[PDB]
Amino acid sequence: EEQGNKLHWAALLILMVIIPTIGGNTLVILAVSLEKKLQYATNYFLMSLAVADLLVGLFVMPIALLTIMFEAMWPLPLVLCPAWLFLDVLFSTASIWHLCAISVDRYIAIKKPIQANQYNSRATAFIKITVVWLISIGIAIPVPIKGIETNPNNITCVLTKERFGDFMLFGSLAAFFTPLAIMIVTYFLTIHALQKKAADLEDNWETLNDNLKVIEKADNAAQVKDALTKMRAAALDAQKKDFRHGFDILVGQIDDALKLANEGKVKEAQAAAEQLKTTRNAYIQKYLQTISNEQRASKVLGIVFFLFLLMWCPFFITNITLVLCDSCNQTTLQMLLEIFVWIGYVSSGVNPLVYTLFNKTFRDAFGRYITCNYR
Numbered sequence: 001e002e003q004g005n006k007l008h009w010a011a012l013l014i015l016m017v018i019i020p021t022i023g024g025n026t027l028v029i030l031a032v033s034l035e036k037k038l039q040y041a042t043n044y045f046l047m048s049l050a051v052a053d054l055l056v057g058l059f060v061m062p063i064a065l066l067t068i069m070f071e072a073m074w075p076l077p078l079v080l081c082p083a084w085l086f087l088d089v090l091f092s093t094a095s096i097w098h099l100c101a102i103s104v105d106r107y108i109a110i111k112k113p114i115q116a117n118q119y120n121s122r123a124t125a126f127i128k129i130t131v132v133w134l135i136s137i138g139i140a141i142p143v144p145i146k147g148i149e150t151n152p153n154n155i156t157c158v159l160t161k162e163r164f165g166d167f168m169l170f171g172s173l174a175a176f177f178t179p180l181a182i183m184i185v186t187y188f189l190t191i192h193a194l195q196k197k198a199a200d201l202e203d204n205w206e207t208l209n210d211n212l213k214v215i216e217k218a219d220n221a222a223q224v225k226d227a228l229t230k231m232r233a234a235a236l237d238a239q240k241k242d243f244r245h246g247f248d249i250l251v252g253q254i255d256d257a258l259k260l261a262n263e264g265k266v267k268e269a270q271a272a273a274e275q276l277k278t279t280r281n282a283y284i285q286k287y288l289q290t291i292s293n294e295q296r297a298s299k300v301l302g303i304v305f306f307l308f309l310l311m312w313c314p315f316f317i318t319n320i321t322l323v324l325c326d327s328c329n330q331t332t333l334q335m336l337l338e339i340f341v342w343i344g345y346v347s348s349g350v351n352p353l354v355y356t357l358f359n360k361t362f363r364d365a366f367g368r369y370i371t372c373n374y375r
């Protein structure tokens with residue numbers, strides 16, 4: 001039997017996988033480099049991810065077409081065979097752990113809204129980036145250390161089940177199933193943190209509005225004195241420079257209205273509280289817009305990161321199946337793995353572009369670069 005010719009697959013993968021990978025990732029790299037409105041610590045996570053995915057498109061994917069266009073034999077020098085396999089595992093592991101790091105960072109941005117400093121966040125982002133790259137080297141390093149065996153002076157550039165079986169098993173657990181478990185946990189932690197944030201907002205909004213109704217109905221000075229002291233210790237619950245002054249206005253306004261209540265002026269205190277209703281609306285509507293934006297961004301990150309992990313699932317499941325199952329047809333599972341490697345390349349390839357397309361400023365940058373603007 002003869003398989004035939006598979007050049008049509010090679011041409012299809014250049015147009016629909018390699019070109020979009022190199023194209024989409026350079027656009028993300030250009031946006032973070034040229035647009036000053038995007039030069040923030042959180043986007044350096046995206047740039048590193050885009051660099052890793054761009055390096056797959058230029059150095060891993062074109063070398064991966066050779067097995068499709070030619071035979072099983074390696075045409076390039078012997079030294080470049082473990083080097084290509086190493087870069088393949090390195091850059092593909094980096095793209096999975098970057099999303100894991102972006103997810104944990106985004107959860108921290110919700111759980112810890114304050115304590116954010118521009119200079120300190122840059123250092124913190126670079127530290128987390130470095131850790132992700134060191135994690136990726138550690139998972140990819142067993143390939144060149146173990147090496148690939150050759151009488152013939154030519155080798156077949158593929159990891160065998162006899163030599164790399166355990167690497168394929170524990171490498172998959174470390175590169176995919178460990179960041180997947182972390183991302184599942186952070187998903188439910190983010191769902192809990194966003195509900196708690198909303199529940200505390202209503203808790204303070206109700207306490208503010210209910211004590212204000214006591215003042216508008218008050219007849220004596222004692223009714224105002226007690227209802228205003230409750231708002232004094234509850235004003236710091238919604239706030240904690242912008243938050244330090246945010247509470248300071250209302251805390252000062254309550255103290256000024258309590259001064260009138262101490263004096264005995266009931267009408268003057270009631271007037272100060274009704275003029276305070278326009279001040280509480282300005283902070284409630286602002287904090288209500290912040291939670292809606294956090295929830296919208298988390299829903300976007302969720303679907304995009306889930307579709308990424310879903311496209312890597314066929315490769316890592318079949319991988320473990322070929323290793324653990326001995327009764328399974330090895331020929332059919334190898335044929336499926338060849339397709340699943342390419343579905344994974346698509347997944348990492350278009351991953352940063354798809355995500356950044358939901359940010360209007362990033363989407364506006366891409367629209368300028370496709371017509372070669374660069375401002």
Ligand SMILES: CN1C[C@H](C(=O)N[C@]2(C)O[C@@]3(O)[C@@H]4CCCN4C(=O)[C@H](Cc4ccccc4)N3C2=O)C=C2c3cccc4[nH]cc(c34)C[C@H]21
Binds near residue numbers: 088162168322335338
């Ligand atoms: C996409 N990339 C592909 C790359 C790879 O398989 N490259 C070869 C060259 O292609 C195969 O898939 C081919 C396709 C046809 C049959 N093949 C095999 O049988 C064996 C896999 C295998 C070996 C032993 C036992 C079971 C399966 N292949 C190979 O060695 C390694 C990866 C990887 C392995 C382990 C951890 C990882 N993290 C990230 C990654 C990764 C990135 C990830």
Ligand SMILES: CC(C)CCC[C@@H](C)[C@H]1CC[C@H]2[C@@H]3CC=C4C[C@@H](O)CC[C@]4(C)[C@H]3CC[C@]12C
Binds near residue numbers: 019020369371373
């Ligand atoms: C046949 C294969 C090997 C070559 C494929 C050519 C690739 C590298 C080409 C084809 C179209 C190209 C893109 C066309 C448009 C732009 C907009 C420009 O502002 C920045 C670069 C960018 C994003 C290009 C980068 C390189 C690109 C992806």
Ligand SMILES: CCCCCCCC/C=C\CCCCCCCC(=O)O
Binds near residue numbers: 343
């Ligand atoms: C998707 C059906 C193609 C499978 C036909 C079998 C031929 C095997 C030869 C090369 C495998 C490359 C095909 C992988 C393309 C899928 C990637 C994608 O989703 O864009």
Ligand SMILES: *C(=O)CCCCCCCCCCCCCCC
Binds near residue numbers: 014015369370371372
């Ligand atoms: C600036 O105005 C943007 C650049 C415009 C696009 C240039 C087109 C380059 C063509 C190269 C594609 C080669 C691969 C073909 C597919 C098989």
